[PDB]
A and B are shown apart, each in its own frame.
Chain A
Amino acid sequence: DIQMTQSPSSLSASVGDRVTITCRASQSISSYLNWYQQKPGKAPKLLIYAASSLQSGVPSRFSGSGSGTDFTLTISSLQPEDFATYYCQQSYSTPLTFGGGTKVEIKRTVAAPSVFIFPPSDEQLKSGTASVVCLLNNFYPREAKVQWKVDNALQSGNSQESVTEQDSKDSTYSLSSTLTLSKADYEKHKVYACEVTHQGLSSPVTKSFNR
């Protein structure tokens, strides 16, 4: 099998910026490499085939180069419709393999998250489960760290989080983290805290409540 390593996995840029994406093959695949663009909820769209051949109708600001193991996709000046995820694909031998993808996102100024914590409702507690929610709102960049502490015990493995896509009007992100406990474990403890780390904050921000 031929592994295709794509880098970087993500990048932020502005309109008019030049963008370079790299795909590396585990062995020589000659020029049998293709580049695809994909937007959320949409099928992939072919941009370049045979390493350097533009698919008909693809704007000329897209270009591809390389042969053997090293390949590059270049957008000479980024346009608003170019913010998407890009995939490389070797077509040299089966099994056909794709790169892990490169997500091109919008560049903006740092914005710290507004943090809120939500205790479980009494309604849910009658069901036998307690969900505690921490909301990180309208921040940039996307990377943020959330730590759950119950009576100063770090919670690990009992939380899930999801992140929105960049807001259309301000390009911020929002993140929610849900800590799931049984009702018995929730009633056994008092202090519930969500500690947020972000580059917009000079030191971690903790929001908490006492049951």
Chain B
Amino acid sequence: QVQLVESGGGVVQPGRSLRLSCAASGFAFSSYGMHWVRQAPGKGLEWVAVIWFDGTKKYYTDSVKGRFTISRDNSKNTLYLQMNTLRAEDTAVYYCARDRGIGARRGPYYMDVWGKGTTVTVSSASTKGPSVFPLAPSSTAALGCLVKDYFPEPVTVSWNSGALTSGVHTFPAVLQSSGLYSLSSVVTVPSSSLGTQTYICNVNHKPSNTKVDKRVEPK
């Protein structure tokens, strides 16, 4: 069974360093070229670097030259990416992938096996739990919760301890100019229901050990 197991991602400040690992099993690792490919949030795929099967020839995208170093330990069947002098734009999910290559020179051919990715977040913000504000319904009615100013991702939002699921929309997080994230979760309910029915959004931000149950009422 062919495997590429990744690790080493995390949340760091600009200028700091990270080292990613990609441990291979189930094939002749030392006979494959290996790539690093990254995907910033909501963006496309960007090639990062490649290393030849024997570790001699290496190539990099321009934006990581002199900062990132691709390497491999064939005795451990592991590929590495040393990421130094990190920038906010380096924030992405980082994938490793094997490439059998083509030709006597063994240039890249295609990437048929991929790791599942490891997440790198570069930010000068520090860990912070969110504030949960109500999105109160007024005069089929909509209500919700505004989960504002937290870092890092992720937060989880359920409604009424998981008992209320239909009509619920939990939006993707946005990154504010402050460096803190914010997201909203809304649910639609019949207008008649509001007078008696209770509504609580259950917010959990594990990186800060913040757990907030916020009840949303008409004002």
Contacts and interface: CB of A to CB of B under 8 A. Distances in A.
A43 B59 contact: no
Nearest to A55: B112
Contacts of B182: 160, 178
Interface string B75-98: 000000000000000000001000
Interface stretch (B66-74, B142-150, B155-163, B195-203): B142-150
B184 A96 contact: no
B108 A94 contact: yes
| Interface range, A side | 35 or more
A44 B182 CA distance: 28
Contacts of B35: 96
B176 A44 contact: no
A176 B171 contact: yes
Contacts of A65: none
A164 interface: yes
B136 interface: yes
Interface string B103-114: 000011111101
Contacts of A135: 135, 142, 144, 184, 186
Interface in B183-219: 183-184, 186, 188
A49 interface: yes
Nearest to A95: B61
B131 interface: yes
A206 B35 CA distance: 50
B46 interface: yes
Majority-rule SS of A interface residues: strand
Given A43-B116, A95-B61, A116 B142 contact: yes
A9 to B, nearest CB: 10
A96 B50 contact: yes
A121 B135 CA distance: 8
Contacts, number: 119
Given A43-B117, A135-B186, A137-B188, A95 B133 contact: no
A44 B95 CA distance: 9
B133 A121 contact: yes
Contacts of A133: 135, 144, 146, 184
Contact of A164 (B95, B108, B142, B169): B169
A62 interface: no
| Interface range, B side | 35 or more
Contacts of B140: 114
Interface string A161-181: 111100000000010101010
Given A43-B115, A101-B44, A116-B142, A34 B184 contact: no
A127 interface: yes
B45 interface: yes
B110 A91 contact: yes
Interface in A18-47: 32, 34, 36, 38, 42-46
Contacts of B117: 43
Contacts of B46: 98
B110 A120 contact: no
Contacts of B11: none
B5 interface: no
Contacts of B176: 160, 180
Contacts of A93: 107
A179 B176 CA distance: 12
Contacts of B133: 120-121, 123-124, 131
Nearest to A125: B133
Interface of A: 32, 34, 36, 38, 42-46, 49-50, 55, 87, 89, 91, 93-101, 114, 116, 118, 120-121, 123-124, 127, 131, 133, 135, 137, 160-164, 174, 176, 178, 180
10 contacts: A43-B115, A44-B37, A45-B114, A46-B110, A96-B50, A97-B47, A114-B188, A162-B173, A176-B171, A178-B146
Q: Name the 4 nearest CB pairs between A and B, nearest first.
A: A49-B110, A96-B47, A43-B114, A116-B142
